[PDB]
Amino acid sequence: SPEFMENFQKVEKIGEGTYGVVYKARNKLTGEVVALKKIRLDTETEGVPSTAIREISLLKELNHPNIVKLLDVIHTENKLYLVFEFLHQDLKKFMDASALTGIPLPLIKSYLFQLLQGLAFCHSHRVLHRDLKPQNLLINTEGAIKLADFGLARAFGVPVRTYTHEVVTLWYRAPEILLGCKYYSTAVDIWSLGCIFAEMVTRRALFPGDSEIDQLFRIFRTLGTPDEVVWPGVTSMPDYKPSFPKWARQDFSKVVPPLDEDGRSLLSQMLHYDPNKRISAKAALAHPFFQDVTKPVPHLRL
Ligand SMILES: O=S(=O)(O)c1cccc2cccc(Nc3ccccc3)c12
Numbered sequence: 001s002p003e004f005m006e007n008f009q010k011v012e013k014i015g016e017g018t019y020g021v022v023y024k025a026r027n028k029l030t031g032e033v034v035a036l037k038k039i040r041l042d043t044e045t046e047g048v049p050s051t052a053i054r055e056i057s058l059l060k061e062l063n064h065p066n067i068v069k070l071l072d073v074i075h076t077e078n079k080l081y082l083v084f085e086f087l088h089q090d091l092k093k094f095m096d097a098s099a100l101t102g103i104p105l106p107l108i109k110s111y112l113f114q115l116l117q118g119l120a121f122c123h124s125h126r127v128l129h130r131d132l133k134p135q136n137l138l139i140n141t142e143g144a145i146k147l148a149d150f151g152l153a154r155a156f157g158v159p160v161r162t163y164t165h166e167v168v169t170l171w172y173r174a175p176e177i178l179l180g181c182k183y184y185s186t187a188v189d190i191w192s193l194g195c196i197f198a199e200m201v202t203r204r205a206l207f208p209g210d211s212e213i214d215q216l217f218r219i220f221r222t223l224g225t226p227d228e229v230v231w232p233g234v235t236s237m238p239d240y241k242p243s244f245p246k247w248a249r250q251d252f253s254k255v256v257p258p259l260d261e262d263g264r265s266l267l268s269q270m271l272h273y274d275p276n277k278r279i280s281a282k283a284a285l286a287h288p289f290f291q292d293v294t295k296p297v298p299h300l301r302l
Pocket residue numbers: 039041048056073075080082158
């Protein structure tokens with residue numbers, strides 16, 4: 001039987017992703033609580049780009065424990081309401097609440113492993129996230145972490161508004177995107193996740209830039225300014241400028257102090273400059289860093 005917006009009682013606002021506010025709501029007929037996302041459409045031109053429609057279709061096809069579950073899509077007067085499973089807690093909020101002590105390594109390992117499983121699945125199905133950041137990763141009481149807030153709308157020009165609150169998306173953006181690559185690859189998500197891995201460990205964002213050029217320079221100052229030896233083709237990328245300062249690479253003992261050689265090995269493979277050399281999500285799952293991975297439950301005192 002079709003669901004109608006009248007069937008839902010708004011409880012509270014639980015956030016405001018790239019598509020406006022997200023509300024916790026209660027289904028009046030089943031009593032189930034869900035997360036509702038409101039999407040304002042745009043018949044401004046004539047419709048949604050065919051390629052966009054295909055990408056939304058691709059995302060809808062995915063069913064995985066590490067991808068937030070879409071339960072239904074309600075259509076009403078130029079508006080779309082996405083009905084999702086209810087989750088309300090995210091990695092950003094959790095890290096802020098674990099600021100004083102940091103998230104324990106077993107949980108860091110579990111979350112990273114699960115996010116890699118989610119990404120491996122998406123990537124094998126030709127789906128990229130494109131906007132991975134702590135804010136977009138939802139967690140539940142049982143220890144799962146899930147991908148959400150995919151960067152689909154801005155990537156394929158979907159007729160809908162975005163970033164109701166603001167931005168900070170630059171911090172996790174892969175260098176090939178910052179340098180204007182004609183075509184990027186699934187490797188961009190691995191870069192983002194590597195930044196998130198480092199952030200969980202150090203309790204601070206790795207490259208908190210305030211502009212594309214500042215973002216690039218922050219990356220260069222830490223990993224060294226790339227050259228043809230380290231990244232073949234970099235000096236010919238659209239936005240590459242020979243005038244870029246030349247910085248030497250920093251040691252990870254300094255960049256991510258708490259990590260040992262297994263952690264450093266994996267991090268270095270996730271932050272490799274060359275997209276063609278950056279570790280894939282599938283290969284990362286087999287990294288020695290995950291030998292002892294388990295599924296700890298988070299301490300959530302809401
Ligand atoms: O495919 S749907 O499941 O609706 C869908 C699900 C989730 C997000 C969507 C965003 C834009 C357009 C859609 N489709 C659409 C198609 C026809 C009319 C209005 C919207 C979206």
